[PDB]
Amino acid sequence: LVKIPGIIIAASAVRAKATRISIQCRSCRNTLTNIAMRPGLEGYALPRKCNTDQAGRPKCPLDPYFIMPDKCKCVDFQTLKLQELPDAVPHGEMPRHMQLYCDRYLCDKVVPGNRVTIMGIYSIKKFGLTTSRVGVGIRSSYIRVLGIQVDTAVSPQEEEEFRRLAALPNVYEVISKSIAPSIFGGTDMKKAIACLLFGGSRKRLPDGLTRRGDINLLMLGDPGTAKSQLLKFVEKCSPIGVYTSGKGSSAAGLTASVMRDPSSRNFIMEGGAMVLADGGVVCIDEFDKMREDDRVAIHEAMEQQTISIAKAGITTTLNSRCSVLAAANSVFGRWDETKGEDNIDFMPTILSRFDMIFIVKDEHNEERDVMLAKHVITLHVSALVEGEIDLAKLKKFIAYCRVKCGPRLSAEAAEKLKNRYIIMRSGARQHERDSDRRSSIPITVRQLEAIVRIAEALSKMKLQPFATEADV
Amino acid sequence: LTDEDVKMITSLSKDQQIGEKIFASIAPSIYGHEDIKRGLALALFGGEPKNPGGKHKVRGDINVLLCGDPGTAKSQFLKYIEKVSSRAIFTTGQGASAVGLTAYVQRHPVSREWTLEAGALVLADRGVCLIDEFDKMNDQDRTSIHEAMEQQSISISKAGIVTSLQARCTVIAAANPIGGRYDPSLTFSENVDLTEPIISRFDILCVVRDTVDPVQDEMLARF
Amino acid sequence: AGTVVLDDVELREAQRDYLDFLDDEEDQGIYQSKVRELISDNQYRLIVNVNDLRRKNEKRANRLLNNAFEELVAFQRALKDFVASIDATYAKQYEEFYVGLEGSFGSKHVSPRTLTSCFLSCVVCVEGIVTKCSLVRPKVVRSVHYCPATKKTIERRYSDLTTLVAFPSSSVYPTKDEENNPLETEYGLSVYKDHQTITIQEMPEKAPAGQLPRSVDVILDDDLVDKAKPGDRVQVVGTYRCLPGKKGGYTSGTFRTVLIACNVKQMSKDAQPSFSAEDIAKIKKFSKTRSKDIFDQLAKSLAPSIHGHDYVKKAILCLLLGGVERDLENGSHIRGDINILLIGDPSVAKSQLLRYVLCTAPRAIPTTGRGSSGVGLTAAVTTDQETGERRLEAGAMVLADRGVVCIDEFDKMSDMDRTAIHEVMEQGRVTIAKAGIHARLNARCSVLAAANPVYGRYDQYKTPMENIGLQDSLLSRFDLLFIMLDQMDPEQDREISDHVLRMHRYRAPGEQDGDAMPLGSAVDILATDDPNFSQIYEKHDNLLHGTKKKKEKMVSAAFMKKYIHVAKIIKPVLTQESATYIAEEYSRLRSQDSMSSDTARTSPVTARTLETLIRLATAHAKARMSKTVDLQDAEEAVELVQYAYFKKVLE
Ligand SMILES: Nc1ncnc2c1ncn2[C@@H]1O[C@H](COP(=O)(O)OP(=O)(O)OP(=O)(O)O)[C@@H](O)[C@H]1O
Ligand SMILES: Nc1ncnc2c1ncn2[C@@H]1O[C@H](COP(=O)(O)OP(=O)(O)OP(=O)(O)O)[C@@H](O)[C@H]1O
Ligand SMILES: Nc1ncnc2c1ncn2[C@@H]1O[C@H](COP(=O)(O)OP(=O)(O)O)[C@@H](O)[C@H]1O
Ligand SMILES: [Mg+2]
Ligand SMILES: [Mg+2]
Ligand SMILES: [Mg+2]
Numbered sequence A: 001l002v003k004i005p006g007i008i009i010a011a012s013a014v015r016a017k018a019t020r021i022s023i024q025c026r027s028c029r030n031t032l033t034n035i036a037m038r039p040g041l042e043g044y045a046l047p048r049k050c051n052t053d054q055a056g057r058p059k060c061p062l063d064p065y066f067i068m069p070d071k072c073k074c075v076d077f078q079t080l081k082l083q084e085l086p087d088a089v090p091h092g093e094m095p096r097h098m099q100l101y102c103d104r105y106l107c108d109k110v111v112p113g114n115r116v117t118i119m120g121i122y123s124i125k126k127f128g129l130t131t132s133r134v135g136v137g138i139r140s141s142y143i144r145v146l147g148i149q150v151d152t153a154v155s156p157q158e159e160e161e162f163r164r165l166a167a168l169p170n171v172y173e174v175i176s177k178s179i180a181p182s183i184f185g186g187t188d189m190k191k192a193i194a195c196l197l198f199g200g201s202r203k204r205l206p207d208g209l210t211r212r213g214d215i216n217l218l219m220l221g222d223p224g225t226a227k228s229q230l231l232k233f234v235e236k237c238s239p240i241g242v243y244t245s246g247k248g249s250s251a252a253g254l255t256a257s258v259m260r261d262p263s264s265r266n267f268i269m270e271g272g273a274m275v276l277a278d279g280g281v282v283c284i285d286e287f288d289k290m291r292e293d294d295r296v297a298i299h300e301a302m303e304q305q306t307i308s309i310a311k312a313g314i315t316t317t318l319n320s321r322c323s324v325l326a327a328a329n330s331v332f333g334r335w336d337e338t339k340g341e342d343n344i345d346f347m348p349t350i351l352s353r354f355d356m357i358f359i360v361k362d363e364h365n366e367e368r369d370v371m372l373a374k375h376v377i378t379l380h381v382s383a384l385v386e387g388e389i390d391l392a393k394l395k396k397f398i399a400y401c402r403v404k405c406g407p408r409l410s411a412e413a414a415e416k417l418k419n420r421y422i423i424m425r426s427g428a429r430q431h432e433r434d435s436d437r438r439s440s441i442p443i444t445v446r447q448l449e450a451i452v453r454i455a456e457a458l459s460k461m462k463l464q465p466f467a468t469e470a471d472v
Numbered sequence B: 001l002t003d004e005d006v007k008m009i010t011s012l013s014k015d016q017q018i019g020e021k022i023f024a025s026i027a028p029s030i031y032g033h034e035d036i037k038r039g040l041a042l043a044l045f046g047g048e049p050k051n052p053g054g055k056h057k058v059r060g061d062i063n064v065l066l067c068g069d070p071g072t073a074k075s076q077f078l079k080y081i082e083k084v085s086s087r088a089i090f091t092t093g094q095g096a097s098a099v100g101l102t103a104y105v106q107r108h109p110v111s112r113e114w115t116l117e118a119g120a121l122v123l124a125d126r127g128v129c130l131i132d133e134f135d136k137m138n139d140q141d142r143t144s145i146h147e148a149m150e151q152q153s154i155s156i157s158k159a160g161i162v163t164s165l166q167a168r169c170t171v172i173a174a175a176n177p178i179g180g181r182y183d184p185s186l187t188f189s190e191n192v193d194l195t196e197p198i199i200s201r202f203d204i205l206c207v208v209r210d211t212v213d214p215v216q217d218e219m220l221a222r223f
Numbered sequence C: 001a002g003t004v005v006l007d008d009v010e011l012r013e014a015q016r017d018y019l020d021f022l023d024d025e026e027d028q029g030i031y032q033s034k035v036r037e038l039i040s041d042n043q044y045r046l047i048v049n050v051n052d053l054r055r056k057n058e059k060r061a062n063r064l065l066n067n068a069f070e071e072l073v074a075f076q077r078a079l080k081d082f083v084a085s086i087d088a089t090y091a092k093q094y095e096e097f098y099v100g101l102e103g104s105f106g107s108k109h110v111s112p113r114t115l116t117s118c119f120l121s122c123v124v125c126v127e128g129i130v131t132k133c134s135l136v137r138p139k140v141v142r143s144v145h146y147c148p149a150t151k152k153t154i155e156r157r158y159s160d161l162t163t164l165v166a167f168p169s170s171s172v173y174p175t176k177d178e179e180n181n182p183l184e185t186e187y188g189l190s191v192y193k194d195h196q197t198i199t200i201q202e203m204p205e206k207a208p209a210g211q212l213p214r215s216v217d218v219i220l221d222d223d224l225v226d227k228a229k230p231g232d233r234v235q236v237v238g239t240y241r242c243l244p245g246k247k248g249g250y251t252s253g254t255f256r257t258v259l260i261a262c263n264v265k266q267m268s269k270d271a272q273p274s275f276s277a278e279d280i281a282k283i284k285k286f287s288k289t290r291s292k293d294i295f296d297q298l299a300k301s302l303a304p305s306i307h308g309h310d311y312v313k314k315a316i317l318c319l320l321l322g323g324v325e326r327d328l329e330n331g332s333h334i335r336g337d338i339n340i341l342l343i344g345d346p347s348v349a350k351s352q353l354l355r356y357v358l359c360t361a362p363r364a365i366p367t368t369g370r371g372s373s374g375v376g377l378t379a380a381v382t383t384d385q386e387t388g389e390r391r392l393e394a395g396a397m398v399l400a401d402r403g404v405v406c407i408d409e410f411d412k413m414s415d416m417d418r419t420a421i422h423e424v425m426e427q428g429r430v431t432i433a434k435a436g437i438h439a440r441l442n443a444r445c446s447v448l449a450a451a452n453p454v455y456g457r458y459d460q461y462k463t464p465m466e467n468i469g470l471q472d473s474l475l476s477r478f479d480l481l482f483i484m485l486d487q488m489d490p491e492q493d494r495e496i497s498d499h500v501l502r503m504h505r506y507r508a509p510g511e512q513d514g515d516a517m518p519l520g521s522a523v524d525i526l527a528t529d530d531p532n533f534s535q536i537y538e539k540h541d542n543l544l545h546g547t548k549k550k551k552e553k554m555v556s557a558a559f560m561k562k563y564i565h566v567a568k569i570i571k572p573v574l575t576q577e578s579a580t581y582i583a584e585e586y587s588r589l590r591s592q593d594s595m596s597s598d599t600a601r602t603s604p605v606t607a608r609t610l611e612t613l614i615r616l617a618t619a620h621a622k623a624r625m626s627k628t629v630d631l632q633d634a635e636e637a638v639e640l641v642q643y644a645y646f647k648k649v650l651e
């Protein structure tokens, strides 16, 4: 019995291996039931002679037995490929591999890419001492898995804590000051981040037309600021969360792709960040640089929460119910305030998809050397906390509020929001009309629903079935 | 490769001039370039990683970018670092390397064995990745280096493998300027053919500027 | 050894229970009617809802779902007895009568991933997508032979031992007489049943993201064979079984498993609706009682959550209803499909109209600008790679035959893709050829596209030609073009914001109770039945939070679906008054001097515009269920074309 660690890089389809078989004789039709099969990669040689005797009658043939397939007790059966953990491989050295054999409830406990520890019997394949070159006496090795542990549920105590956390008067302020506490400034940024982390309400109308509750946030800013740090924190803080760039990741894409395997003809779908973080948050860093097909795809991944792929094989509509937290720089690098809105070259259709856009500037005020001192303390006191929520509890609370409560606007809240929306639409139209340029940032019904979503998120932090006028 | 006499190390530590001895002790077969030697020694020792709570990672790796016009010992510096460093691996922006920046999964050519061929950024997780000819990378290589050098991880989504696997390396890179000659009239960014996000993730940018100096030329020629 | 079962108590009880369940005459005779109906239309498979069986006899239901072949053979014996009782001649005309299963399978509803070995020999329901069909092969079930030497004719039967032990004597094909006289087979007297193997894959949008897909092999036997083609999302009900290996001497213990289908069904959106006589009566009442404004009643009731765009909604109703295809005697063809393009400012609910038609229309296919690229949009030609032969592959617009392709972000689609869809958008066919194969596939679809203008937003001060970045050849085959414009008028904002905020407050009755969140996660789907293959319908929606109150009702979605299905079949004939009006209308439309200055043409007026006047008038007449294209229909068509084809350029 060995215990080894590793990463799983292949997982075969679950198949059927017999634990008990029954064989029937071709002539006398008598059966030889419930023969026990050896577990693992071990075979069975059928008896070469029928048991039944009747001296008056002639004998059965030499090899008379045939597996009766319906009288067979089969169990689930999977073969895995374990690679040596990348941190365990010696320096100039190829990784080692190990074949694993799973059984009956160890099947599908792991997926390729999991880091696992295995307990199992270090065994050889016993398929008959046949299949004969150079290596003699060598039989293929595998581990017969007896236990799988994947290296990485709201108990009523946790639930009671979540209820009393929502019931706090200043739950919004606790959450807001608890998200990126080690980042100086950006208080409204952090409040918006909290709202994105909870999200609004996803609605399906009677006509079948869905409406998203997921909030998309864009951070345009100067490169000094901590917005990549903010994306990193958010992807550690959300239950489902993926950090990527506009061009995807190293050996991962941004959106999904679909391909047919010419041999097996299966439709393989590569998971990009958008479909991997379904039900969660995608943090697209360096949003401004992105390949054109990805832009066209995130047009409707950000609004319809789907990715429609159609190959000559098939047509699919993958789910991407994900919030988008995006960060980008100005087209000139720095904001260059005199350039108005000519320093962002995002098309209006992409900016429309975003609920809130934050422009972030490094002001050159001298008293913001408290910000330097703040960094120095953070790097001092780092190795060794206020009244707030640690990361794990925040993750659990966000997941809990997302699954339990979906708020709706109250009537008077809706009235107030309608009037405010009309006011700001008139203001934006007037600002366009007065200025000699169409506004690069639009205010549309999509922004009305954005404010509805932010109000619903605020109400959801408090587990409130209806969103008041306060959170509107 | 395990040390038994800390005593000599500590005695050298009290030398009160150990720093300059260390700096003079790197790339002994390269003449001059003392600022690059200070930077490379600093990177070779590295800073302190730290992660307040578990949510504010800051690396301690000192990434160094040597950008200099040709024939200025950049590749010799990278080879010295590969010799001295434990867990150093060498890679290039061209296709002329055993290991490549990007992770992929395939059947190994000599093993015939289905292997997650983790890239050169994760093969040097606790060490240093040396990228020669940094400005001549793919778009794929560029997003790979950007991910490893911002997140200190590499995210696979290839076969059925969805994994994230750690690349906490120090990146030491050598690049050439645009046009094969560094122009000090321009900024470093518009000299090098690297985007701003890639350059910002380096602590030390060594501009290896080549000029005709008869004394320095003579000393180098003698060397 | 050959024995017979003189008494099988279990078989007796099972057959009696199944015949009792089928007799049904006392219990409103549903299966009585179903069996007479399969006798009528000359079938031999009876599709049995297991919910009815679970009601009448729960013990049988459990036994059948858990011991599938024993119970299914008992139930097919009972079915043959029932048919013979109802009609002995038909019953003798078929050797075997099969029972297919239907309804709700509790834990027996799986996907190719969750179909594990704990289901062997149980009836299971598997949903997925067909990846490969095989050829339809005949399998000999009864071979007849003639010996010319002795004039004898013999016959040899082959039992279906697909998932049972086959001894080699079971599969010997007779070639010789006992005297070693050559036999010759009577092919027309022998009996062959056809056989097909498909592979069903887990649906890509249902599988865990990033993992490799899981498949299951499926056996289809006679009358179930051509029921699925690669790329279909089907539901297969059958028995899960372990296939026999070949007679060995050593076995590794591994068995190939397979699903033996007892029923195959498609997405129920694309199936013929069931029409109770009350439904037909209601449809006739609707059409006859309200005839002048029935079209507007249907149109404004189209996408209730979208406020405004009433002309767009009328056009989309016309697309859902369609014109009438002309099939001339010399083989010439004129399309009856309406193609609609929406160009507009961002966030004016055009992606929402596309999605509504996707939800509502049968055989609607989605696509985005760069999600489909030529071959993925129209057909393709690949090589079989195992037979060396060319194979045709249907793309999006072939799969949307007699349906709709809802192309979104049509502008971001590449130019070659739009060139590719030119030929489909007018001729309703895809001409495809590599050297070994050439074909002319039917793609009779209507295209509903959404685009954005150049510069992202529409420029009120530029010509619609300069603002739609498409050429007259592409535009002209879009027979209606709607510029959906974001005007920031404050009273329009009143209306829209009120409607939108009102849709964001509605809770579905009963299901929602005050704070619920909808999502389920990757198990809850298989927990209950799929509402994609699942089997009293009012006319108007009751008043609710969707609307405040007024003297004008809202057609129910279900009733509208049934009504549109009935009306789509109609073929109204153009009358002479309509023909004269349309001809003079078109002649007036072509002449620009009728249309004001400072008013530009959104799309050119060609003979296609005349054809679309006819198509829209015909669709309107279909809505009224007229059977004639009257002058009101022609007027509605002309006013829609007039609204669409001209835009006021401002300054
Ligand atoms: N300062 C120096 N001291 C010692 N040797 C040097 C020095 N500068 C250059 N050389 C020698 O010059 C040769 C060229 O060096 P190297 O290949 O490292 O230059 P490079 O910067 O890589 O050029 P490129 O940019 O074209 O790759 C080397 O063999 C190196 O030994
Ligand atoms: N007139 C309207 N009535 C109801 N809802 C509307 C209306 N206009 C916009 N909306 C809302 O705006 C949101 C975005 O709409 P949609 O995504 O369909 O815009 P779009 O026109 O496709 O934008 P783009 O052209 O940029 O793709 C939808 O949720 C929709 O509910
Ligand atoms: N206000 C701040 N508070 C704390 N750290 C900051 C702040 N601004 C910048 N930093 C630090 O600067 C480093 C680089 O910032 P980053 O977020 O990577 O920049 P960018 O905005 O270009 O992505 C980060 O480690 C971050 O911690
Ligand atoms: Mg950044
Ligand atoms: Mg070099
Ligand atoms: Mg859209």
Ligand SMILES: [Zn+2]
Pocket (backbone or CB within 6 Å): A025, A026, A027, A028, A029, A030, A050, A051, A052, A060, A064
């Ligand atoms: Zn025998």
